[PDB]
Structure 1
Amino acid sequence: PNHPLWYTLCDRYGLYVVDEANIETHGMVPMNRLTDDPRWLPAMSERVTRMVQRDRNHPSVIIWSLGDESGHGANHDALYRWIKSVDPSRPVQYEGGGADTTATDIICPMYARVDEDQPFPAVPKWSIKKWLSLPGETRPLILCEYAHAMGNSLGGFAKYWQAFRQYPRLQGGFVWDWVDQSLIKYDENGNPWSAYGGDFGDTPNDRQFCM
């Protein structure tokens, strides 16, 4: 959840918001180790429930999200239903565990390609065009993340937009991401320069991946 003024500005200027619970357990092995564990349900529940209690009156918020990259655990299904019960006015989405689990109203993959399948075991990233028509599938698809804009990037961006415009159930996505997470450091003469991972003696680090 963002600084409260963010929603006020989105209400007034006009932007659709996905408001997202502060839950990410990316580094766990497997990713759902905590989210499938009932002992972590209390802690997870408060990150979801308290977000809804704070932000449910903002018109800019159109979609709730259970968090990010925490696999798919029974705790997600429980909190999905909690939101659906408390606030019927907004769809709930969540990408973890393969982007099309029972904890999501929207097929919301990250970095699924337009035409190319990436058939990873357990959590495949189908071509988005293919994903829509999988046997029994009926939901809209909106990429929670796509077109990773790291450095000299956004190659193939037009391929997404051609597809979004051709397929009714391909309803767009959220580019990753808005702003480089570089930090200011200063040389011996006080001149500022942009620093990334590792530049503060931080180790292990993931270098320029913050930008």
Structure 2
Amino acid sequence: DEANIETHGMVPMNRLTDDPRWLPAMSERVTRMVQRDRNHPSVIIWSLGNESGHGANHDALYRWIKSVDPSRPVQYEGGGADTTATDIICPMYARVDEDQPFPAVPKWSIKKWLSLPGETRPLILCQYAHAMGNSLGGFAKYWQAFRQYPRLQGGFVWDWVDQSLIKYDENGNPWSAYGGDFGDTPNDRQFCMNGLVFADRTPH
């Protein structure tokens, strides 16, 4: 269960989450979620949101949850996937054997990440295998690694269902539309369709 906090478009990404003036608004997104959902057995992990860098507001909120509900781990991927605001190394799109050593926020091979000096946490990818279009090549390589390494405890595929929307042609017949099809601009075109299933639930 994940708080409704994503500030991906900021530059740098943590511009708001490291600003104390935004701590109150962020706090309510996290606290009100825990107050609503904490009795559901299906929730096993809380997440602090998505793609909002790593700011001090995250560390304050991580600790709040750890205090109020010690029954569930807290994870958060921003700022490098392995910051002090996450109990689980939870990268997005880290590869199985290939490192992508981006500055400040490298994406190590998952097998390598587990054993970096001093690291001891489990690793569960918050997003992996981007199923956009004809994709999922290399899926098996993840599963072989998850089964061989105890601390590679799986992951969440990206993602379930294409976000295509229905439009109707001049003859009234429906068709699947994506970014820019409503006059929207700028837009990111077909990047909204990344699912294992089509919007109507037919499998890819």
- TM-score of the superposed pair, with normalisation by structure 2: 0.95
Q: Does 1:126 align with 2:104?
A: no
Aligned 1:60-209 pairs, distance under 5 A: 60-209=42-191
For the residues of structure 2 that align with 1:24 and 1:41, how far apart are their CA atoms? 14
1:135-180 C-alpha deviation (Å, 9 max, x unpaired) = 0000000000000000000000000000000000000000000000
- TM-superposed deviation, 1:115: 0.1
1:171 aligned counterpart, secondary structure? strand
1:40 aligned counterpart, secondary structure? helix
User: When the two structures are aligned, how many residues end up with a matched partner?
Assistant: 193
Q: Give 2:35's aligned residue.
A: 53
Provide the identity percentage.
Answer: 99
For the residues of structure 1 that align with 2:171 and 2:180, how far apart are their CA atoms? 22
Unaligned runs of 5+ in 2: 194-204
1:67-103 C-alpha deviation (Å, 9 max, x unpaired) = 0000000000000000000000000000000000000
For the residues of structure 1 that align with 2:169 and 2:33, how far apart are their CA atoms? 41
1:14-41 C-alpha deviation (Å, 9 max, x unpaired) = xxxxx00000000000000000000000
- TM-superposed deviation, 1:134: 0.2
2:12 aligned counterpart, secondary structure? coil
- TM-superposed deviation, 1:105: 0.1
- TM-superposed deviation, 1:120: 0.3
User: Which segments of structure 1 move beyond 4 Å, counting only runs of 4 or more?
Assistant: none
Unaligned runs of 5+ in 1: 1-18
For the residues of structure 1 that align with 2:100 and 2:8, how far apart are their CA atoms? 20
For the residues of structure 1 that align with 2:188 and 2:120, how far apart are their CA atoms? 38
For the residues of structure 1 that align with 2:190 and 2:12, how far apart are their CA atoms? 26
Aligned-residue CA RMSD in angstroms? 0.2
For the residues of structure 2 that align with 1:190 and 1:49, how far apart are their CA atoms? 46
1:102-140 C-alpha deviation (Å, 9 max, x unpaired) = 000000000000000000000000000000000000000
For the residues of structure 1 that align with 2:61 and 2:156, how far apart are their CA atoms? 23
For the residues of structure 2 that align with 1:187 and 1:170, how far apart are their CA atoms? 48
For the residues of structure 2 that align with 1:186 and 1:121, how far apart are their CA atoms? 46
For the residues of structure 2 that align with 1:50 and 1:79, how far apart are their CA atoms? 12
Q: Give 2:13's aligned residue.
A: 31
- TM-score of the superposed pair, with normalisation by structure 1: 0.91
For the residues of structure 2 that align with 1:190 and 1:202, how far apart are their CA atoms? 22
For the residues of structure 2 that align with 1:208 and 1:145, how far apart are their CA atoms? 18
For the residues of structure 2 that align with 1:189 and 1:133, how far apart are their CA atoms? 59
- TM-superposed deviation, 1:44: 0.1
